[PDB]
Symmetry: C3
Subunit: 278 residues, 3 copies
């Protein structure tokens, strides 16, 4: 009767503790799986006094590089457009076959980019393309981390074929002065290596072709490559769920439930004492 | 005297354990509230072999669509600007009333965008606007996820009025070839639905109008829509704080404090034994 | 013999529990250090009915501000380019010395930017630069949070010298209508103050200079400053590791290990009872 009712109610509350433990374990499994599916990303900005000289692989095609200069000032000085000028950059011409065509072979002009961002160093390039019939004259450029790595790397063709994939390729148009402010984003993945990518913001400024004012009629390309700021953006995903913390938390919960059960036994004893007193 | 001093000191240390428990509970409350206020964002890039044909709602106004083409090559071929050309895209003209004017009715030309990013497929559009007096000629365009969803959706006016809000609208100018490299960002919120948005990077290339070299004097708009890469950016916030883990951790802490109290009792017994030995 | 083997095996399992505790503590140390090194970033978009009037510090140089207007419509109305027009904005001219030159003194024209994003308010500025010989005509502009803060701040020179550092400076070119859609990103760091930065997306539209069609031959700069959307992006790093949670979890683990040890003692007693029964 009453004794049996109390006994079955208390075995029921013990089963309730066991069910709470099982529900906690199931919720832990689900939360661990969800956390594994969705690692959380962290971004840290690491300042560098001077950047490693980037490699700017340009694809002029028929465009003739009139001049290349390294300018430490915030702006390039006045120029003499349309004619060859002094060249003061490090260039390397390489003809590789892009893996995505495998048939067409492209010639690239790798230029050593600016190093000292703190001095606002920039590289100013001027190309000239003779009369053409394309109606849209632009030159492709691809940025990769280090020009020296390219120089001292065997099978430079292999290095370039890796860049045509691991790096994006943009365009700069004629009749502008495409000012490219570039930044480094290094993403760290779980499987070791850290991948470096080039972000770049482009600002086009019209070129005033009133100076020739003659039958020149030849496209002029002006470009400036410069580092946006001394900060490299390190981005890495973090696996918020690790087995050891989960095991420790579940063990603590199980210990708490066990002490709850022994407290229930002590409550049994207390009720027995109260009944005895009556 | 000494007995009373020890007794009050030990009830004090028990109260110290209780105060440590209360401080831990208060810190847990504050941390849980702060974590609820600030869920942490996670980004995952999901690769798709081919994108769902996006809908490009253009607003030419008086501009006449000279031609539309789907080009699988990395570049469009040579054109014949200023004159009507072959049209090889899927277009649908719809006149809806934008909810933000509610009075002005705008006509849109929905074009089926490129699907196969892996083939570097792009859609090249050419419009011609006769002589005008605006001094700034540009055409609005709005990107939405699926053109087929628009086709097979009742009250297409309602669908477009939803896009004039759930999607951004940019411009492309005349005298350029606006190359738009577009990407999909899908943000998952707590309350169910996942919202898709279009990021886009635009590269303007001057159009060489030397080919006409006559009294044509009519604005020409050239646009290229292309997928930047096969990766859709899934972004979702994660509520790092859940009640069950907090309860388990607090229960473990309380169990530890209880065992500390019973260890203090055992220390009482040990001191009593030491005194007895003397 | 067997008794000694069992005794040494069980002191070995006790040492195994101690070693598991030590390994858990070491893993906790490593995880806490890694989490401290890499706080996780959270982004929240806070909607604002109207923005605080931003300050647009322009650097015309010799360019003459033909006109400034506040337009609530989505587009500016028709203009009369090349000639002075009505001015209806709040401007303040200040000549400060940029800390990075310390020798060159720059004159800035601070304009009160648009406030009511919800009305799609924008500020349209027109400058005229007489015949020059630069070949690349552009005007620098720098955005800072509040124009009123600049007005009611002593040593306005100090305020501007702070902006030439805490804010980025972009350019807008002549012959375009640079449409600048700007947004606010507020980053909260551990050491108190919250830093406000201006993101901006720029859309250049060719200016049709056919209206003059004469010997005017003077550069015209057109700019539109407008808020991209009513959402300010709050970004803050979160230190996922706090000492109290780590202590609670480790204490729970230690309690679990202690109960495992006492369960091992109970297993000793159970084996002794079984042997006695035989
Ligand atoms: C093996 C590689 C691919 C990683 C994925 C393995 C994951 C899914 C496994 C490894 C450790 C597991 C945890 C370890 C043990 C337990 C036992 C008990 O506490 C229930 C939950 C809990 C906490 C498990 C959740 C799932 C888990 C996280
Ligand atoms: C109800 C919706 C809006 C979500 C917000 C409810 C939040 C604030 C409540 C629900 C569960 C609560 C927790 C649950 C119970 C306890 C009891 C004891 O452990 C103290 C802290 C702790 C851990 C609380 C912190 C605040 C809490 C997180
Ligand atoms: C002091 C400022 C610079 C912050 C850095 C101090 C960090 C490294 C210290 C402070 C609290 C420490 C924790 C506190 C105490 C313990 C004791 C035991 O549980 C081992 C791990 C654990 C959990 C430590 C991990 C390292 C720790 C996180």
């Amino acid at each position: 009767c009453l004794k049996n009712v109390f006994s079955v109610l208390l075995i029921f509350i013990y089963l309730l503790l066991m069910a709470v433990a099982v529900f906690l374990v199931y919720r832990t499994i689900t939360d661990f799986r969800e956390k594994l599916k969705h690692p959380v990303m962290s971004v840290s900005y690491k300042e560098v006094d001077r950047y490693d000289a980037p490699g700017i692989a340009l694809y002029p095609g028929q465009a003739q590089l009139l001049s290349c200069k390294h300018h430490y000032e915030v702006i390039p000085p006045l120029t003499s457009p349309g004619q060859p000028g002094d060249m003061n950059c490090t260039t390397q011409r390489i003809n590789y076959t892009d893996p995505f065509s495998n048939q067409t072979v492209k010639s690239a002009l790798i230029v050593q980019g600016p190093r000292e961002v703190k001095k606002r160093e920039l590289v100013f390039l001027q190309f000239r393309l003779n009369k053409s019939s394309e109606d849209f004259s632009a030159i492709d450029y691809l940025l990769f981390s280090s020009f020296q790595e390219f120089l001292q790397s065997p099978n430079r063709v292999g290095f370039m074929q890796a860049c045509e994939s691991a790096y994006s390729s943009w365009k700069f148009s004629g009749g502008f002065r495409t000012w490219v402010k570039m930044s480094l984003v290094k993403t760290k993945e779980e499987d070791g290596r850290e991948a470096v990518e080039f972000r770049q913001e482009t600002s086009v400024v019209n070129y005033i072709d009133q100076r020739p004012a003659a039958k020149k009629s030849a496209q002029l390309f002006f470009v400036v490559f410069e580092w946006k700021d001394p900060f490299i953006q390190k981005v890495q995903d973090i696996v918020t769920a690790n087995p050891w913390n989960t095991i420790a938390l579940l063990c603590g919960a199980f210990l708490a439930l066990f002490k709850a059960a022994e407290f229930a036994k002590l409550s049994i004893k207390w009720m027995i004492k109260i009944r005895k007193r009556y």
